[PDB]
Design a protein around this ligand. Sequence first.
Ligand code: UDP
Length: 433
Amino acid sequence: RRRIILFPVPFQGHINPILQLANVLYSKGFSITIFHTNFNKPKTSNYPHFTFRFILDNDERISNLPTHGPLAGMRIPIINEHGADELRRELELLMLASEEDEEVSCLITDALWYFAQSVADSLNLRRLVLMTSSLFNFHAHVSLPQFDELEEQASGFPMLKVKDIKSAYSNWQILKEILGKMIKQTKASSGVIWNSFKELEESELETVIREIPAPSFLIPLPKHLTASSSSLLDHDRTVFQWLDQQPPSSVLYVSFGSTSEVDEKDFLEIARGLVDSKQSFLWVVRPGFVKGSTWVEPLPDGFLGERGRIVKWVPQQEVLAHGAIGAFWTHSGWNSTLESVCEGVPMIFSDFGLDQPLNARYMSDVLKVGVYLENGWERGEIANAIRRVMVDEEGEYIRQNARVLKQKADVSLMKGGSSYESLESLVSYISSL
Ligand SMILES: O=c1ccn([C@@H]2O[C@H](COP(=O)(O)OP(=O)(O)O)[C@@H](O)[C@H]2O)c(=O)[nH]1
């Protein structure tokens, strides 16, 4: 009796949170249509209860781009600057074809689809925005003019060091423009859904209240459901029979997300830090991860030994919840970070720029749930980080913080919790649009 249209950005880390939201909203009585590009499409047969519509790449034009590297997502700007007419065409089709007693309540877009705002306005259709990065991260964007007028303790941001900012915003006419339209149009939206929870980013709520005149809602989506049904790669599910053989809290999970890439100098250094830590590890290396190779070709044989295993892909949150996991070495993508937080797993942080440095520093020095490794890649430093989080008594407090943080995330979903009442408002709000 009330349908919601959800249009994600076709990259994991963007597909994952939006389909989590859609499932949650489905949990609350709404119908779901997903607008998706054919590129990077998820497995629609995992969502029998969703209707999928494929758009904007079907009859191609400027999107005959490469499918796998740092230059896909050039689709993002292209579609932003050229997709408006098709989007309006497709939305109008769907609103024609519903109704008997089925309105369309709103359109929820990834905040990167800033072109969607004027399209929805043109159809008198409320639009809601979904942020896939943190509130802290929005607090640094919407402060990127004090930074410009000007190495350690960033002025007006004691959380961060200058290294942090100068690595985060190091491509800054490259995405200056589209980062700002993004903000411009989520301010002008009818509401913003944030994938976190109030007690995770309490220090950041004031900014969001004062910068964004639309209502905000903080929902830790990974506490509602994992993102597994929206996996673009196939799960290596054999890891769990191997995890069932390990003692509790004695495996380090290692994974640098869906898009990062490292050059062989560094890939072989990470291996040795793993071996040098003498901890057991389950290492996800996406085929593509390494400069030179397809998968993990520069790796010698048995080099990991009896304690190491390597795979192309897992159901990450489910692994983070297995009792064998004692720590998570991550590139600090916001989804991974939130998943590890919601499962109570402490982290070792690396990063590849772009919100990742700020996620790492916030979890490292504010919440104190991990060790920020990046002054580079060095074996002994890597081994020291793994052991301080996993074994050292010095790091008992980080492990303890991780457990309490998860409890805070659990409590927030209970009646009178921040996340509970946030979701309750969101449903109420959408139902009156
Ligand atoms: O082997 C893997 C590696 C990662 N992921 C998921 O991929 C997403 C990556 O999102 P994130 O923001 O952390 O990283 P990004 O790829 O955007 O840098 C997370 O939900 C992970 O749980 C997964 O399911 N299996």
